[PDB]
Amino acid sequence: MDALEGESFALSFSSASDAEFDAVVGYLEDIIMDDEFQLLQRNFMDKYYLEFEDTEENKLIYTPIFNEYISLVEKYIEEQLLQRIPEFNMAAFTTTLQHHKDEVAGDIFDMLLTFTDFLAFKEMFLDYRAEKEGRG
């Protein structure tokens, strides 16, 4: 496939349009495949997947555990990005990302989606434990 697009796109300064946005997406993938990231993720997931048990009642332990993930993992990603971008805005980034999910690789964000999607977070752990029993 081949096309020609580039006339009314952007005025003169490209950034939040797709130039800078995409740039961030790249720096993200570099960390996702990063060895140090694989260790940290699996390290905490080893305990988290244990606490998250399929039950009919809701436990209060889910509140502290969740906050820990947002302060440990979510914060980790932010810090790593700021190391090169002191003017980064993770707040406005994530908000717009929700809609930009139509352009950016959805399969990739699906992982980060666990930032608020409690359904993806839980389903993620339950799926991890299922693989331990050999299935799929």
Side-chain angles (χ1 to χ4, degrees), residues 119-136:
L119 286 68
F121 200 46
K122 180 179 180 180
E123 184 178 84
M124 183 184 63
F125 296 119
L126 276 66
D127 176 84
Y128 181 79
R129 180 180 295 188
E131 186 60 270
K132 296 295 182 179
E133 301 181 273
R135 188 177 187 154

Side-chain angles (χ1 to χ4, degrees), residues 54-133:
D54 177 79
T55 56
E56 61 183 278
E57 61 181 272
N58 181 89
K59 298 178 66 58
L60 186 66
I61 192 66
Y62 284 72
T63 307
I65 295 173
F66 178 82
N67 303 149
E68 182 64 278
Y69 188 86
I70 302 297
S71 180
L72 186 277
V73 185
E74 180 180 278
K75 186 71 70 59
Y76 185 70
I77 307 174
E78 184 180 270
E79 296 298 272
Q80 296 299 90
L81 293 171
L82 291 252
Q83 296 189 270
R84 53 189 58 137
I85 308 171
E87 302 299 273
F88 195 73
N89 298 90
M90 189 60 174
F93 182 68
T94 54
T95 54
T96 307
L97 217 171
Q98 304 181 331
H99 300 258
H100 195 274
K101 184 173 66 63
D102 185 87
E103 184 64 273
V104 74
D107 181 272
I108 296 296
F109 187 51
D110 280 308
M111 180 273 297
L112 296 176
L113 184 55
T114 58
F115 280 143
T116 55
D117 200 272
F118 190 84
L119 286 68
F121 200 46
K122 180 179 180 180
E123 184 178 84
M124 183 184 63
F125 296 119
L126 276 66
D127 176 84
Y128 181 79
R129 180 180 295 188
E131 186 60 270
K132 296 295 182 179
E133 301 181 273

Side-chain angles (χ1 to χ4, degrees), residues 15-26 92-93 96-98 100 104:
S15 179
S17 298
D18 182 273
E20 183 179 89
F21 202 109
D22 286 48
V24 184
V25 179
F93 182 68
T96 307
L97 217 171
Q98 304 181 331
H100 195 274
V104 74

Side-chain angles (χ1 to χ4, degrees), residues 37-52 65 68-69 71-73 121 125:
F37 179 70
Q38 291 300 332
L39 182 66
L40 174 112
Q41 191 62 30
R42 274 64 187 168
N43 189 329
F44 283 85
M45 282 182 59
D46 176 84
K47 202 279 292 184
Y48 278 55
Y49 102 96
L50 288 173
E51 301 298 90
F52 280 70
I65 295 173
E68 182 64 278
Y69 188 86
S71 180
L72 186 277
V73 185
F121 200 46
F125 296 119

